[model samples]
Target: EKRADLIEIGAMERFGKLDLPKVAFRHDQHTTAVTGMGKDCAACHKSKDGKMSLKFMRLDDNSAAELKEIYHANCIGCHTDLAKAGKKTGPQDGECRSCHNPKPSAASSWKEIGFDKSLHYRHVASKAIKPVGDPQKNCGACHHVYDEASKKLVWGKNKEDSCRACHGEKPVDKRPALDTAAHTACISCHMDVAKTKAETGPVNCAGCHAPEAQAKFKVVREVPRLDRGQPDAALILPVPGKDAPREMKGTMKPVAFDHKAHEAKANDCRTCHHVRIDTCTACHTVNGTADSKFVQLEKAMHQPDSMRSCVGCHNTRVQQPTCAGCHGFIKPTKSDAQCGVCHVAAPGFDAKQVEAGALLNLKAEQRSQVAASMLSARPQPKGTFDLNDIPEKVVIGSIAKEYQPSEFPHRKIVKTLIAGIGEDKLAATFHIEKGTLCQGCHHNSPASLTPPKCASCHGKPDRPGLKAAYHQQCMGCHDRMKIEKPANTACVDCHKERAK
Candidate 1:
């Protein structure tokens, strides 16, 4: 009644079950015993034509008695043969209680491992395996598409998900299930290399499958682009244009997409094009459609996931380390006053005027004209101002009543302000003759280097008047620019409790 460590049975049914007396198997002890005698894994498990062919039988949808007999003949037969040869072996006789111990532990220990991008890259780098097609044919060989018409699997242009994507825990449609298939393929390859005593991938499940081992494997920083002919740029046709269908129409201006720049940014073209190659407008029309799950073209482009969107793609670029240190943590919505940063409209300009100004092609103007306009418009520091013209120390006791007054660093701040505005393109352009950078700090008044102090307008903190007003200008600008300086940390960071 003793059971074997592993067994295989086959039957033609919706669900096939294995029948054997439950028994304990000590994997570590057996492994040590075999290895101590200078024998390896292949000593017991034999592989034929790259598959494990253990001494097991097929139970052809037969009765329980028939199934039991099949197991007895194979299991006991193998053990008796091994015992006769004077080698240690599993039980052969009807030691029912010893063999069928209900609380038996599994013989082999297993840990689930992920075949992530790094592991895949390592496999590609190995020189042992025969090249799939060209010298670069590595990742493309195994991950494939099943051609239903041809009744064969074919390699598609895009590298697919790992083998586990389709094959689950058990075999389906004659294909080995997840566990069996992975072991058969991976172990067989490893064992073949081990026979020649050459460098190869892991043989034991723990080697490649261990979490720590897999993590230690190096990743290819830049995986070579799988060369599929892709266009550098494309003129996005208006959906409702002459060539387009009658029902479809375009709302936005036709955009000349910089596909080359986009390709350089993305790891693969498949990021945007999931299934087939088609113009985005072809599938995503102005009006919502059935094919695109009722998503309008505008929505498709503006969607957070869509790379084609102006906002979506720009949002991604802002996450890079350089920009993210300041801007990454900011909320998506913009403040009313901060809208001029990118939009760039004249002060007091209405929405219509702003839109009209944005439509201008400012690049066509001569450099001299552009430079002249910028110098005339932007704020300049007060020329030859007396030392008395500026305040010495304006005690800001409102928010800092409980703390020491922050050293204003007034002259240095003014110099920095002048430098930032002098070089900025947008500030020069829109700040035409009436606007100046000083408006950033002392707004709602004339643009002057020597603007009035915060007390002149702000009044006091938490009061009914302009404390909110001053903050509405000062904090609003900092929030808009995404200032990360330590001076302007948090309100609590600046306002510590006063010493007793």
Candidate 2:
């Protein structure tokens, strides 16, 4: 089924009360009609400084009357011409209600297209776009910083930032709306490339905005790293306290942010840095700041539910089946030792120098080296108890006389869980203690070689009986990891039928 390409034309609503209901303008329909008439974007759009204006038949919407007249004249004039030629035509002149009905028939199907790393790389690699600036780079083509002093946008060479930093969801001050900015920039460039008959990106609204069309965009598997003077590694220091040795406090040891490693993992820089490609602390200060909307440094990094937070993002990685076998049952501890895994004191860097704020003052490369040293020294998780100490098997049948006692491969299960975690950093980092793995099965009791039997607490009143406890723990884990073998219904797999 064809999707509706409708756009509600209600720009005039901003100026005053609308006399008629918003017009449901079908963009693709109009595009087809105009294309069949042997006309291009230039037929309706005006140009200035070789860039196509986003506005239709007008460069600026100076007044309400002017905008209304421009739309009515062009729309009615086109429909009248089409009707005269004995062809299909839209509502004309006196038929305003037909175009602006209170209840519109079709809903809009405009999908927002993102300029991801792959698309950004494609634009960078394109030969059609000639680079500009001192050394000449492709980034200068679209990237520009607003010069407050000059009252104009200037090519901001190495200071390139996200477009949303200037152009927001809606128009503000001198900046046009994000939609308007994106369409004007992207479509205009595409149109220019099309004029030369060169291989280029989409020019039509549906080309980028359609769901199916967006899915067809060529994705580069490995996009080259964007070199906007971004650091390879950085030291994430705690907010300098006043009560220290007149320097950085010993509390909350600094974290080594592996910037380059994370860059490879993320689709774009915006994954961590939102509107600006800057440090999180820039907006989110030590104390809650106005810039960060009162979100403090600790909360910014440790918020459990927000994807923007360090802990929140890491928590998502453990959801994979391999990690979930144990992690699914684990709760956020926020213990001192748990925090120490990521936040570590660099042994390579001088403590005295760090305390005196020397680390903060160091050059980017020097600071990165210090951070790298800390990251490299990070300890891997020592797995559960030794294989010989782990019970090979446990015959469990205390409550079940219907079937033979089940031979649980306790040792084998522990080894399998260990193997599943493998070399994953998140699992290794969080599962720090040797007994951490044992806690998955033998929980609620202290980590020990000989934990209490299932009947000790589970078989008691108000708790699951021994039979239910065994089945729930064993089958629940298998179900969580999606291991179908020895199926949940196949009770005989664990325990065979006893003699009659």
Candidate 3:
């Protein structure tokens, strides 16, 4: 494996085009040498506000000439002293090519790490992490809000926003860059904990950035739900405006979203809420808004390509092999009945409330209850018609001059397909029609127990022909479902050899 602690020092590039190849500096290598000789990070880093500055012995960036001199003096000075003391050291004084190489053997094997729910819960559960301001909540230790009045970072209780809200890839006027902020905050805390002789998180780059290191992290499978006044279930209200009057005629029904269920499936709140953990409506309004980059609320929720959109997320879930067996063939369409599954009228709401759009005024508790009730009331789909009516077997011998007809297990296959879609709510809700499952193979005809035979439409000599259709349908499905047994090449497996 390549070194995870490799740092490409291309400091000169910030000023202008580089004159030489960037230095391939091994951070852990230098740290090991310094630590072995009874030194710490302070040997290179200066202090500011009782915190280790990330800069190399400088508070801020100076001119390019000054910066070059600073690096050359400090680096070569230490190396020369070590050499004079009869000790192993790095490249000294005038060896330019030694430090700047076009091709460095050590390549960086760094992987960006994610702070998922499991890691978040571990920090919350740690005994060493005491709450800063809030007596009960430990979130104050990391979360803070920038106060414009005082021009300082302050802990605003109940206003815990994600770090990315202010800090981005590039630095603002006073705020640090996102990467700099993260490293500074995390390392400082880890160093503090290490002083107490406690089991602390990684301080070195490789410890956190290495693939094998990240794999060994403790995963809290059943993390306790975070309390931030979030709803368990929410009624996604219809777009409100003069277009949708109090009478609510020709208006879209409100969608019931199961927030708690979604939380269990996602790794973090940021998975959907990229910058802020606020409701989507805050930025995405009915009409095009500047904050949402002119993307209206309707597009925000229904965009087919967006991973955050409701339809997009559901579309990805249908790709699973179990659902793909049927959904793969069904051409996507916005059916009126399918829309009713999520956008249902509440069971107990008064006629005036439903018609006049007064459901938005309902209390949070009441709304959650209503949404939960609607979700539970969703109708389950029936597998097929009466099992007795289904054929036990069907022999396909229309074009069987070369090989014997395939004895398809009709009833057994129906049972297997039904079993494949067992208890999945998505399948149950969408597969409303009785013969919906039959459409997978007996397609193009009406959904029923007895569909038109393959010969009726597919046996034409000019077209794909019945032989190609049968082989393509059967083999294609087997390939998609990952069924390995009864190989497609084995002719005798499905069709027997004709007797001479």
lDDT of candidates 1 onward, in order: 0.52, 0.78, 0.78
> Model 1: what TM-score?
0.50
Q: Residue 320 error for model 1, in Å?
A: 8.0
For residue 449, model 3's alpha carbon misses the true position, in angstroms, by 3.9
The C-alpha RMSD in Å for every predicted model, in order, reads 11.3, 3.4, 3.6
For candidate 1, list the clashing residue pairs, or say none: 170-177, 171-177, 377-432
lDDT by residue (tens digit), candidate 3, 1-500? 48889878877688988898888878888899999999999989999889888877688777788778878888889899999999989998888888887888476789988689889889888878888886778888888888899988887776776678778898998788888888888889999999998778998888899888999998999988776778888877653434323322325666788899788877888878876887786666566456778677788788877779888877887777776766665665467776776777778765456545677578889988988887777665565687668788889888888889899878887787778878776677677678867877877776787788888889664445899988887887777666686788888889898896
Q: lDDT at 492 for candidate 1? A: 48
Local lDDT at 421 for model 3: 77
Q: Per-residue lDDT of 1-500 in model 2, one digit per residue for the tens?
A: 34547778888888899998988777777888789989967777788998887677898878899999998999789899989999999987889798888886575567877878888889889989988875558887888888889988888878887778778988998798888888778877887898898789886678888888988888999999988998888887655533224432435678888888787777888877875777786766556556778677788888877777889888788778877766776555667888888778877555565545666667888888888888888875576678779779988877668899898888887888888878776676677877777877777776677788878888754567777777777787888888888899996999998886
**C-alpha TM-scores of all predictions:** 0.50, 0.89, 0.87
Worst window of 10 by summed lDDT in candidate 2: 241-250
**Considering summed lDDT, which 10 consecutive residues are worst modelled in model 1?**
1-10
Error (Å) of candidate 1 at residue 114 is 4.9
139-179: candidate 1 lDDT, tens digit per residue: 45455668889998777655455566567777788666777
**Quality of model 3 by C-alpha lDDT:** 0.78
